[model samples]
Target chain A: KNVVIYADGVYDMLHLGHMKQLEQAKKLFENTTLIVGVTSDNETKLFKGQVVQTLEERTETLKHIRWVDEIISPCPWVVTPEFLEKYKIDYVAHDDIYAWLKRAGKFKATQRTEGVSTTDLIVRILKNYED
Target chain B: KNVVIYADGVYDMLHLGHMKQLEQAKKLFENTTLIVGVTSDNETKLFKGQVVQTLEERTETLKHIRWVDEIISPCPWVVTPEFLEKYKIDYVAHDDIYAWLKRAGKFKATQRTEGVSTTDLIVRILKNYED
Candidate 1:
């Protein structure tokens, strides 16, 4: 079976860091399917703080990234054993991305590109633009 | 008339660099309207070489960037005087983004975020992912 690589995040702003993370996962195996699950808007605001992009916007944005083979909008905050088994995920790809998939033994610390974050960017905008 | 801000680019693999460029334009004036024009796939290939995302995908992605109020898919390679007049554009926003819009006297050099480009990111992918 082809290797199924999985990555999931709030994915707001959809920056280079996110792209690089996904790229790292796609590079792990030949013919790998990279499925990105975006956390729901409500979950992101409550858990991650202030949702900048709605679930639909985030999903639509993620759908366009070249590395993403498929996307699951409103994916649960935690990746459960069933989720991995159902998707046949061989690896959960991200930089230190395994709080829930901990025992899955499928985590990969993909090389992360630095210097950008949704929170930082939002703060920058507010700092520079808010008058 | 309301101040209309216009920005145009390949906008492929949409990233923070692009969002910041558009965001800078949006912050320029009160109640400013930000419109982004994305290059067509065929045109981008000819001018930009090897598009990573299709025009439809690029347009869809840009449509979701919070700063962008409108989008022009398959936007012309160069913004012409007539096009500006037609759109009632007051400023063509970008960082060093003018070839034909020069004489229009409507160019606004928006602040550009560094360290990212479609070409650069694509190179990063090919360098690390081509196994």
Candidate 2:
């Protein structure tokens, strides 16, 4: 069976850190396939403040990345057993934010890119916007 | 002329934050291209300490990312005038680490992924290598 890595996130601002994490996941095994699950826009707004980009926008943006083999738009924030089985996912890659998933024994704690986030960017813009 | 954004870094432990930054840079212009310059292994060791991955390894890893249009393997630690001319770079996208580039009036400070780094990962491994 091929090694398939699964990663899920809001990916609002789609930054370099996200790319790095996905890159690391892709490197876990030879010919590894990466499937990215994007959180629904409503969920993002509910949990993470105003959404910057819509679910469709985020998925379209992520699909541009070469490392991502497939994308599950509006994917559930939580990884369910059915989700893993349906995707044939061999491993789940994420950062401490999803550390609780470790209990399932299927989580791989990928590094979280520090310093930057969609919220941070929104704050920066709100606090420092200029014409 | 096409708008080309140049970003140079160690990129040893590729992470999600880096991907986000690159995505941001890519979004800055229409049909914008991104050229990532990975510092030489020796240079990264000098500035950052204990290169985890070789220059070749890092290049191979970065190339896997879709946002990265091209890579400058063994890229110099500093962005010289000659380097900009060579790449025909319109602007340099990087975190505050290259704040000095601002003096040149060509630097665009990208947000850094605050919480993680190659060194951190190495320490994690050394401190908790059970396998």
Candidate 3:
């Protein structure tokens, strides 16, 4: 059986937080297909309430990363009904991401994992183990 | 007129990139209200594909910020059509007319603003001063 792993985001200002998330997700869904989505610049701006790094900038950021298998740009992560049905994504995965999803009705089928995200890990690295 | 800002994200590793955008948005709309949308960790994970910080960590991060006025917590930035039409968002704004926005069709009424994003400033700062 081919289980699918799906992840998405603006991924702007890519950093350790992002890398860590990728690592964690990959580990949890071993031997499965991985799909990552990058949100559009405009959508990121509206959704994030601020312009993130440029889309090209973000694209380059994701492209170079070793963990990301495939990147869908321009609202790749919108989570519309169609997208959910299309990916047939067996696991909508991440680390410690339960509280936020239940409310949005997105995590109904999600599997919670653990580990500090790229952000958390980076913060640890940047702050020199402050976290 | 009370309008919501409706912005969301880990805002982890916060920086100069975020600030410039906030400043630009404030400038564009003068006489209305702003409500910032903040995404919950779970929802953020499902949509964004990474994790930045913990809920408490993100909450404190958002709380201390001056640019953000009202932050509705735990699943705040999910953009269903309901979210878009509900905010009465006068303009879903962003900087740059990059291809990413065009691809997502999210640039419908986007307004490009000036100034390097906080990420740009920080990268310069880090390269010269910190990184």
Candidate 4:
């Protein structure tokens, strides 16, 4: 049972925020495999309720991150129910996602990690920014 | 008079969080055009703090959103009263951005219209998960 950690997102515009996230995730567990899941284009629309990049776009975006060892698509790749039986997914992401996952009582693996996000950076740039 | 409200960011992950923002902006004004700006590969890096998808990928992602009339490249598009004179831009947007633009006095071109932001949505999504 590896203490594997799973994190996923579209990673549309890579930035310091993302690098911080990857850096934080990398440091979270010792000897834990880091698995990232991104949404396919259609799935990104279906699950996330919005579409930004296509499947190819999402996959390629997440693939470039060095912290990630594997990428899953459209979510539910490894359900929480089989955690202790099939494989050892020791860690999951934290932040707002926990509220949804907690309803199912399967989010014990989640950890609350914090850092800046890409959107914040975008806003910073646009705020009367000139160069 | 087709009051265009332009906004853009790296839409890495799709989620319901994004829906509310677009919804809010769309309802702001009559004929309010929402021009979404995405970052180019090289530019996204230098500004806004990160890059998630490549230029082609980011453009492809933003192209599908309903509110977006057009996509702009890199960062720092025209935002000022002079810009209003130049592009006939009517009713720009505001959040914390008003401060910086106000400094330049170019913010007179801004509309201070109300709407939810994409960053707010992402934060909401991440906060919900427990697993």
The segments of candidate 4 whose C-alpha lies over 4 angstroms from its true place after superposition are A83-87, A96-131, B1-131
Give the whole-model CA lDDT for all candidates, comma-separated.
0.73, 0.73, 0.55, 0.53
Q: DockQ for candidate 3, please give it.
A: 0.02
lDDT-superior candidate, 1 or 4? 1
> Residue A82 of model 4: what lDDT?
66
Each prediction's RMSD over C-alphas, in Å, is 14.8, 13.2, 20.5, 16.5
TM-score order of candidates, best first? 2, 1, 3, 4
- lDDT string, candidate 3, B1-131, tens digits: 54334444456554445544554454445554444555677877786886656676665444444355656566455355566566565444454433553465433232443434444545654675554
Model 1's DockQ score: 0.04
* Candidate 3: C-alpha lDDT: 0.55
RMSD, model 4, all Cα superposed? 16.5
Q: Which stretches of candidate 2 lie over 4 Å from their true place?
A: A1-70, A73-131, B96-104, B114-131
Clashes of 2: 27
User: In every candidate, how many clashes are there?
Assistant: 0, 27, 24, 27
Q: What is the C-alpha DockQ of each candidate?
A: 0.04, 0.17, 0.02, 0.02
Candidate 3 residue runs with Cα over 4 Å from true position = A96-131, B1-131
Best by DockQ: 2
List TM-score per model, in order: 0.48, 0.49, 0.40, 0.38
